[PDB]
């Protein structure tokens, strides 16, 4: 039933040449900034836009978010910084686990089971291999590109939501 | 081996009287803002602070994050808003699934298996029941309070990181 989330993303990383550590290793700060940004693009911006009915709502929600973000930074500025690489790894792991917990709570509040949705995203991601079985990388920024004939996940994700609505009716 | 993440948080929500939907239901915007904020407090602020060695690093990372956040909002402002409740649910589910995927990728980049860490957080959360088997709620803000004798997760989470480092050595 439940997907092996970590092994599935680990697999995506190997297949498409994203970073992966075989031994626990603190994530370098410049790389962490990227990951934090990508995560929030989805968990904050897309989530809030898709929760909004107009520009006025959406902007008020973003500003409220920004104020909470700023309060959290101000609180963190008063806390001492890690002094070893192990300390940085431990604090990252702690933060990533709570973040995972909150994401999961948002699924609970939405009444959506995440496993089948994650499975759709995983399969579509893996289907980005070209017809030679190799990833397609664009010369600008090495972005992984979609091959000709690739079926996008969005409509299936939507059909999965409707399926769950029907199951729980 | 792998925890049932969704069922474990669903359980935490029932036990401690947080919201939960039995049928798939779009999350109201004011509630989504809260969840987005809590998620980013961990995935962005705590994660970046624990990735930093000093105030100068940390502030540069936060500003870089904010610039990416602002670019994403500007892009989203040009996209049409959902016009039904089902549309809002579908877009939230989509966003929450990608966010989950990125969190998982951060575990991959750190080389940390999330399951055992999540298990420690889950168990500590569940152990917040008082000695009558009931949650303790503070009159200010109904915050769930820790009972006398509660063992905090942080040191165990750290010991778990060291255990994984040892296993992968």
A48·B36 Cβ contact <8 A:
yes
For residues B106 and A166, the answer to whether their CB atoms sit within 8 Å is no
For residues A1 and A115, the answer to whether their CB atoms sit within 8 Å is yes
Q: Which two tokens stand for residue A152?
A: 């996008």
Nearest CA distance, A92 vs chain B (angstrom): 5
Q: Residue A137: what are its φ and ψ, rounded to 5°?
A: -110, 125
DSSP string, B87-100: HHHHHHHHHHHHHH
CA distances from B148 to B34, B128, B135 (A): 28, 9, 12
Q: Is A155 at the interface with chain B, CB within 8 A?
A: no
Spatial distance between the Cα atoms of B80 and A49, rounded to a whole number of angstroms: 9
Interface of A with B in 133-152 (CB under 8 A): none
Q: Residue B144: what are its φ and ψ, rounded to 5°?
A: -70, 125
Spatial distance between the Cα atoms of A4 and A14, rounded to a whole number of angstroms: 16
Closest C-alpha to A36, from A94, A99, A125, A108: A99
CA distances from A69 to A74, B69, B163 (A): 9, 11, 33
As beta bridge partners, residue B137 has: B144
* Residue boundaries of the structural domains of chain A: 1-169
The 3-state DSSP class for residue A168 equals: helix
The 3-state DSSP class for residue A149 equals: coil
Please name the residues in contact with A53: beta carbons below 8 A apart, sequence gap of 6 or more: B29, B81, B82, B83, B88
Spatial distance between the Cα atoms of B151 and B135, rounded to a whole number of angstroms: 16
User: Around Cβ B57, how many Cβ atoms within 10 Å?
Assistant: 16
A111·B20 Cβ contact <8 A:
yes
Q: Is B163 at the interface with chain A, CB within 8 A?
A: no
| Highest CATH level, class, for B1-169 | mainly alpha
Spatial distance between the Cα atoms of A130 and A152, rounded to a whole number of angstroms: 15
* Residue where the block lists tokens 């200010």: B140
Spatial distance between the Cα atoms of A5 and B90, rounded to a whole number of angstroms: 21
């Amino acid at each position: 039933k439940q997907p092996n989330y970590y092994q599935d993303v680990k697999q995506f990383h190997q297949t498409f040449h994203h970073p992966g550590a075989d031994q626990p290793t603190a994530i370098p700060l410049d790389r962490g900034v990227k990951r934090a940004t990508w995560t929030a693009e989805e968990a904050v911006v897309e989530f809030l836009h898709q929760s909004s009915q107009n520009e006025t709502e959406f902007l008020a929600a973003i500003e409220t978010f920004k104020a909470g973000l700023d309060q959290a930074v101000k609180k963190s500025l008063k806390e001492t910084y890690p002094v070893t690489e192990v300390e940085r790894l431990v604090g990252q792991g702690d933060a990533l686990t709570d973040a995972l917990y909150f994401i999961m709570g948002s699924f609970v509040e939405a009444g959506l089971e995440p496993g089948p949705l994650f499975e759709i995203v995983q399969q579509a991601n893996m289907a980005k291999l070209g017809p030679d079985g190799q990833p397609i990388f664009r010369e600008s920024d090495q972005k992984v590109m979609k091959p000709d004939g690739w079926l996008p996940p969005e409509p299936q994700l939507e059909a999965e939501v409707v399926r769950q609505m029907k199951e729980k009716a």
